[PDB]
Design a protein around this ligand. Structure first.
Ligand SMILES: Nc1ncnc2c1nc(Br)n2[C@@H]1O[C@H](CNC(=O)C(O)(CC(=O)O)CC(=O)O)[C@@H](O)[C@H]1O
Ligand SMILES: Nc1ncnc2c1nc(Br)n2[C@@H]1O[C@H](CNC(=O)C(O)(CC(=O)O)CC(=O)O)[C@@H](O)[C@H]1O
Ligand SMILES: Nc1ncnc2c1nc(Br)n2[C@@H]1O[C@H](CNC(=O)C(O)(CC(=O)O)CC(=O)O)[C@@H](O)[C@H]1O
Ligand SMILES: Nc1ncnc2c1nc(Br)n2[C@@H]1O[C@H](CNC(=O)C(O)(CC(=O)O)CC(=O)O)[C@@H](O)[C@H]1O
Ligand SMILES: NC[C@H]1O[C@@H](n2c(Br)nc3c(N)ncnc32)[C@H](O)[C@@H]1O
Ligand SMILES: NC[C@H]1O[C@@H](n2c(Br)nc3c(N)ncnc32)[C@H](O)[C@@H]1O
Ligand SMILES: NC[C@H]1O[C@@H](n2c(Br)nc3c(N)ncnc32)[C@H](O)[C@@H]1O
Ligand SMILES: NC[C@H]1O[C@@H](n2c(Br)nc3c(N)ncnc32)[C@H](O)[C@@H]1O
Lengths: 257, 257, 257, 257
């Protein structure tokens, strides 16, 4: 079947990539970066992120695989020393699939939609900003501070975590909202976990210019009227060869490897 | 059908109770506190809690209803001025049912099981304590501090919330673990959200005596070997007459009513 | 003696200002916005801030006074209804003086100094940034995240407070440092309180461009080599007529007025 | 001069102690655990704590010294391999003295005073408790939760730190108050830093029984009417031989040694 490989770009990553391609040449494996059924990423979690967005239009037909040439990553959870084993199993393996929930973000002006593997955040064009938070068409609070972060289950170990967010198992179809330096003299303060059909809307009070980020991409949006968040209907599919539990991955990254 | 009514015990609650019983006398409604199909609680969230545990053996056959004679409660979400309307609909209504997840706690010595509507916590017999946290048979961390809290979705607005926990919609079948004054000089720090089949086990290191609480009940357990948490298979059923969304209930309690 | 008055600029503030000037015309009080010995601010805490920086070169010769025409402020702690009483006492009163510590910030390139009443912060030109934190010439930590905040005692109720900082009585000559979304996978996490002669230095790792803020003024600094913080030798002097304790002011703003 | 030595009690500590005593026998050094002018502690920070309280009545005449046979401690900041060097300098050295602020706690019934090197805390006889917090005779807030902690500057790296407290340089004469699981549905939330003459009083609302702790000692106090905190007039004196800065000590304990 078809496959492609992205590389962090350093010596270690390019060489690992050139070798896997060689091993793939020993099997019925056509390299194709247009319609790959398998996407292998070599480097770190950031390299994986870029690979996700590069192919975010054929997600339902792709199985992703993350190799870390550096520190152990949440998405890049395979060691380089297992690259050749991957080649073999990927070839004639009926390997299983693991799917994670994604975050849908909608921006409206006076619509643009995006998909996020980790999170989407909103901040001001300088200084603290003010937006109204509407949950399912009901006003929930008026937020003033640095910004807000809406996170996927797998993205909870990222930006979410730094903002006091909870770590959530990716088998749970949900999204989590956290605050950035909220001034309270009135917000909920606590992070909020939303289910599959709940819609969270952010609306401008005075200023209509915001810095909106989706994972690594950061876009200054002008004359914005609304920002809508909801658990996407699309999912990211991983190739599963062995058992590497999420909590073990949490333990190795933050407690001790 | 059969029904019963518990009261906070003050003048306001007893009188509201005596009136509802009277209204129920105008319908085919046999009062029975042994096998009630309807359990109405009058007072606060604490009164509701006591009512839950009083009938925790017939949960699958009971529909609960909470009336608040004081401040608006998360479980007691009906105003007294609507008591008579409840009577009528409860009589000849095909009212819907809303179910919330519960927490199963297991204690083993050298087994006792309990159900919690809000949370279960563990603390020491004085001073900071030490326990090993095992997630699905894999050691996750060694905790030293004041204690730990395992919370249901609806219980996240309670003790969980004070410990930095996230607020979680009760339609999500999950449990959340938070820390109490963890010493870090090594824990995850972040709250953890577990799904339906994950098992979290707490194990003694040196001392085998702990103060274990399940909602309002607090029991000093001696010679404890293990404390196991998991999302219960049982659920609490509410009677649904109107629409009072969880996030609206969150807003009214913490933001402004 | 000489005095001046700044106004928030709305109807309420301008009229209060025109009246106080009139009352001052009934006494030996020459209006002078060049060398005033008394600076009265009318509006909010922000109006007071602007007044501080407008005269930050004659701080040792000025006594400040804050009037709030809106909500009670930490610096603007006089009600409009007491404006005329201020006029009288300011005229022939041997009123006392209350002084608060200030923050000195130094920026070096490849020097510019500033004074802050509230705080100074540093952030990146987009995304998370990395700087080395040196305390008294000894490397303390390498910070990665959104930014850092160095705060004066009186500024602890402001931005500091939102970042988890402690509230510190302004009679204590100190500065407090807090983190903004630190990634920990290694920082202290806890806020840090420094005494009068300690010097905290921030140094660029890869990028030399930062957004540096001093109170309300925000300046993008390029080719920065070092940012030095220390408790200033200069102090801001207030005119004291009555007793309005700091903790009472804290209580009224955050607990209930 | 007179001196004494306390030991953690294990093999390593007793032997280090027997050797130092021997070295002291080679100088004019009379061992006396009644009126020692020098108190050497061998073990950890806890061993030092016990040594502080054992001699809390002759603090003004004693110079303390902490040796760690285990991990580096904040009070026990000398390595065993430097024990003999200590002996020599302690003998004929005009060594300097370093003094840290202490916390005075007063309990009144229907008075008992105590001194704390680290902190004093108050908790309930089971479950959440309620007390009124009065700052300098002015009601500040009504607290409901697990408890409160009043901490010295050097004690901020201890229990304080786990409760979100700030780390404060011990040259600052102050005390810091932190909350334990405060329910907010109304407290300040932020830690509070008080100066030398401020008095913080805790007063019972309904229940008059509390668990009061001073460092390691924990006493259930019955029929308590008031608990008063203030920066003590007494100070603990250390012997200073070399330069081991507080922030370096913070870095080595929490960042990396
Ligand atoms: N303050 C913060 N703390 C922790 N994580 C943060 C953060 N701010 C941000 Br933005 N993030 C995370 O940073 C992620 C993006 N970073 C990257 O992709 C890299 O930076 C990008 C790359 O190299 O491909 C990955 C890396 O450097 O580790 C975002 O998706 C957030 O999850
Ligand atoms: N520190 C804390 N902060 C917030 N909530 C806390 C808390 N400690 C505890 Br214990 N709780 C909650 O207190 C709940 C029990 N309290 C009660 O049931 C009442 O106290 C009991 C009653 O009156 O029936 C309810 C009330 O007083 O509001 C527990 O289930 C926890 O959820
Ligand atoms: N996220 C934040 N939370 C709380 N306070 C914050 C904050 N971000 C910032 Br910047 N601040 C504070 O905002 C202050 C400046 N704001 C102002 O001066 C005003 O905005 C400026 C004015 O109107 O003069 C005051 C106001 O609007 O209340 C800074 O000195 C910080 O103390
Ligand atoms: N939850 C907590 N987190 C961090 N520190 C805590 C804590 N609870 C407590 Br009590 N403490 C600290 O524990 C200190 C007392 N402990 C000790 O003295 C020892 O336990 C006592 C000893 O061995 O002498 C020291 C040790 O074991 O490291 C108190 O003074 C508090 O500062
Ligand atoms: N594996 C840890 C490294 O990868 C980055 N990262 C990314 Br990109 N995504 C995640 C993620 N989902 N969880 C944790 N860290 C993440 C994160 O910023 C850190 O630098
Ligand atoms: N309704 C708020 C009052 O009820 C108590 N409470 C209980 Br009991 N359960 C909850 C709960 N689940 N969420 C919020 N508060 C709760 C909570 O302690 C507070 O005093
Ligand atoms: N009085 C509260 C209002 O004034 C702003 N503020 C300023 Br400007 N300085 C402070 C300050 N020092 N403390 C609290 N709030 C402050 C703060 O942002 C809030 O909007
Ligand atoms: N040196 C770290 C060890 O000593 C204990 N400790 C004590 Br006792 N006092 C302090 C203290 N003041 N700061 C930090 N840790 C302390 C603290 O509980 C930890 O176990």
């Amino acid at each position: 079947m078809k496959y492609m490989i992205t590389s962090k770009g350093d010596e270690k990553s390019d060489l690992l990539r050139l070798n896997m391609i060689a091993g793939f040449g020993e099997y019925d494996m056509e390299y194709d970066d247009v319609e790959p059924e398998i996407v292998i990423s070599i480097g770190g979690d950031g390299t994986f992120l870029s690979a996700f967005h590069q192919y975010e239009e054929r997600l339902d037909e792709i199985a992703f695989i993350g190799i870390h040439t550096g520190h152990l990553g949440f998405y890049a959870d395979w060691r380089p020393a297992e690259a050749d084993k991957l080649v073999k199993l990927l070839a004639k393996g009926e390997y299983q699939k693991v799917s994670y929930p994604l975050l849908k973000t909608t921006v409206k002006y006076g619509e643009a939609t995006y998909l996020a593997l980790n999170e989407s955040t909103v901040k001001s064009s300088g200084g603290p900003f003010v937006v109204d938070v509407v949950i399912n068409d009901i006003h929930f609070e008026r937020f003033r501070g640095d910004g807000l972060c809406m996170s996927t289950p797998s993205g909870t170990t990222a930006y979410n975590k730094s903002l006091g967010g909870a770590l959530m198992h990716p088998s749970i179809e949900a999204m989590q909202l956290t605050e950035m330096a909220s001034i309270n003299n009135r917000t909920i303060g606590s992070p909020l976990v939303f289910p599959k059909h709940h819609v969270v809307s952010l609306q401008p009070v005075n200023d209509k210019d915001f810095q909106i980020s989706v994972d690594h991409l950061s876009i200054l949006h002008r004359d914005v009227q609304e920002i809508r968040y909801e658990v996407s209907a699309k999912k990211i599919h991983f190739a599963r060869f062995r058992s590497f539990p999420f909590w073990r991955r949490v333990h190795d990254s933050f407690i001790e490897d």
